[PDB]
């Protein structure tokens, strides 16, 4: 049976978690991720995948360090401390 | 855990996930001034390491738990 | 939710010719 | 098709021309910018022309 009796043999993972994107798209036999390309140095992104880019691009996370650069620029990358005037 | 303080001399603690039996042994000696016979550790189903500690024959584990202030 | 698919296909025999 | 008595036109709109339309809504804003940049240059090199 192609149908119900065939589906009853499905208990072998083909993709596990990815150390970089953490999305369960890490092919075990090829040792590559079908979403972020790990371990290739770059991140997989194609221009026909406009939606894919929107999901992962800059701004969709926390921006631990990049969310302050605009503030620091407005003040000229000052160094020191307020003088208690 | 409270049955183990009364019966088995087994002080039961929560410890950091980065610790090992050697460090758990050192800590109890410094803080509580008691000699430990052996340490057994497991990781709970919630993500916090528990440590069963069997003090040596000379230090009564109800006295220590009554000193820390929970028995 | 309810996924749907092609109901039967085939099993309709043949006609005239 | 070719239908009636009209001139033969030639409109070159067979490429993706909607991707390269420039409507100059900024004609007025560019005028105030060119004019202010003229007043700031004058104040920097004054009294020269």
């Amino acid at each position: 049976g192609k149908g119900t009796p065939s589906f009853g043999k499905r208990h072998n993972k083909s993709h596990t978690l990815c150390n970089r994107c953490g999305r369960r798209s890490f092919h075990v036999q090829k040792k590559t991720c079908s979403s972020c390309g790990y371990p290739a140095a770059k991140t997989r992104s194609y221009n026909w995948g406009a939606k894919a880019k929107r999901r992962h691009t800059t701004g969709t996370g926390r921006m631990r360090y990049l969310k302050h650069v605009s503030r620091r620029f407005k003040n000229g990358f000052q160094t020191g401390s307020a003088s208690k005037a | 855990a409270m049955k183990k303080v009364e019966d088995g001399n087994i002080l039961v603690f929560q410890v950091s996930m980065k610790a090992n039996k050697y460090q758990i042994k050192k800590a109890v000696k410094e803080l509580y001034e008691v000699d430990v016979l052996k340490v057994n550790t497991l990781v709970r189903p919630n993500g916090t390491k528990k440590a069963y500690v069997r003090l040596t024959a000379d230090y009564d584990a109800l006295d220590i738990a009554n000193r820390i202030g929970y028995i | 939710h309810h996924p749907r698919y092609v109901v039967l296909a085939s099993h309709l025999g043949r006609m005239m010719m | 098709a070719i239908s009636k008595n009209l001139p033969i036109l030639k409109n070159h709109f067979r490429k993706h021309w909607q991707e390269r339309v420039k409507v100059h809504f900024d004609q007025a804003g560019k005028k105030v910018s060119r004019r202010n940049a003229r007043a700031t240059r004058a104040a920097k090199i004054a009294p020269r022309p």
Partner: protein, 119 residues
């Protein structure tokens, strides 16, 4: 409530270490007491007092190192300016202002004159 930073800045290295351990012992007591009560907000004050003592300790130790390297050309990368990567690789104000001996002569001889065409 809680410790104050301006009060700690007048204590010595050894004193602030003694204070840090005292607040750690007190925090341990609060956590064994919290296990028999419905609430114990004082735990926050002690937890933020440990953060004030640590920040002053690090501030003292960073100044001392900063005096030790005062006025020598190489100093630790942690104590330098955290400008942007490109701002740190651009030319210094001295280098970008360099000029060849030829061009300097042309500048002195023939500067841009200041004039007006009224009359």
């Amino acid at each position: 409530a809680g410790v104050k930073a301006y009060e700690l800045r007048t204590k010595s290295k050894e004193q602030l270490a003694s204070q840090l351990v005292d607040l750690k012992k007190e925090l341990a007591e609060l956590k064994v007491q919290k296990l028999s009560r419905p609430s114990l907000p004082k735990i926050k004050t002690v937890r933020k007092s440990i953060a004030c003592v640590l920040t002053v300790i690090n501030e003292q130790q960073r100044e001392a190192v900063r005096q030790l390297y005062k006025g020598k050309k190489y100093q630790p990368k942690d104590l330098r300016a955290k400008k942007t990567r490109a701002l740190r690789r651009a030319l210094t104000k001295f280098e970008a202002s360099q000029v060849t001996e030829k061009q300097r002569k042309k500048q002195i001889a023939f500067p841009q004159r200041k004039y007006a065409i009224k009359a």
